Amino acid sequence: RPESELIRQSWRVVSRSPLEHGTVLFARLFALEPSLLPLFQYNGRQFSSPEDSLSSPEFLDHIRKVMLVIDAAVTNVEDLSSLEEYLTSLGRKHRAVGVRLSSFSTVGESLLYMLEKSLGPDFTPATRTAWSRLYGAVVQAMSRGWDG
Ligand code: HEM
């Protein structure tokens, strides 16, 4: 694939600072859909404001976990079928925590925002389309967790 390289190459830059970059993704996510904030329940407590999430080690660890699932996708960008069962179960888990499947569209936009901001002029149309396809494929596999 030509897309596989666009994804690989762009991901190298991000993977140098995945927390800083995932922090943009999540700051953007809560700016777009603050109703996701309460889903991050650590010590039975809700974050009141998005900046609260940034002070939580568990939340920042979830940022790193997200970035690693993306890294797993990138590693398998040629054959995602190898992540299908893991991603189905990841879907099922997020269903269980309360995340609606539709919120994963917002996450995709936040991922694309983060890549735009980091890559600036290197975030070409082809690069955007490539990520959109990969992210879509990830979410398609996760959606199996919502049993459909
Ligand atoms: C709607 C946005 C999302 C919310 C509200 C959310 C929320 C959560 C929560 C509450 C957990 C369990 C607590 C934790 O381990 O931190 C979790 C686990 C996790 N999330 Fe997310 N998540 C979201 C998106 C994502 C995405 C996009 C990925 C990766 C693509 C991801 C990867 C993970 C992983 C790897 C775990 C560990 C699951 C396990 O095996 O127990 N999350 N998420």
Numbering used by the authors: 3 to 150
Can you quote the paper on this entry?
Neuroglobin (Ngb) is a member of the globin protein family that is expressed in the brain (∼1 µM) and the retina (∼100 µM) of vertebrates. It is involved in the protection of the nervous tissue from ischemic damage via a still-elusive biochemical mechanism. Notably, Ngb is also a hexacoordinate protein in the ‘deoxy’ ferrous form, with the rate-limiting step for ligand binding being the spontaneous breakage of the distal His(E7)64–heme bond.
Moreover, the three-dimensional structure of ferric Ngb (not competent for CO/O2 binding) under increasing O2 pressure was investigated in order to find out whether internal cavities in Ngb may act as storage niches for this small gaseous reactant as observed when using Xe or Kr as probes. Therefore, diffraction data for ferric Ngb (Fe3+) were collected at 50 and 80 bar of pure molecular oxygen. Therefore, the presence of O2 in the Xe-III cavity supports its role as a ligand-storage site in the context of a catalytic role for Ngb. Our data show that none of the other cavities previously identified by Xe, Kr and Ar docking, including the Xe-IV site close to the heme cavity [Fig. 5(b)], is occupied by O2 even when the pressure is raised to 80 bar. Indeed, only one (Xe-III) of the two internal Xe sites identified in Ngb hosts molecular oxygen and it coincides with the region of the Ngb cavity network that binds noble gases with the highest occupancy. We therefore hypothesize that it constitutes a preferential path for ligand migration and/or a storage site for diatomic molecules.
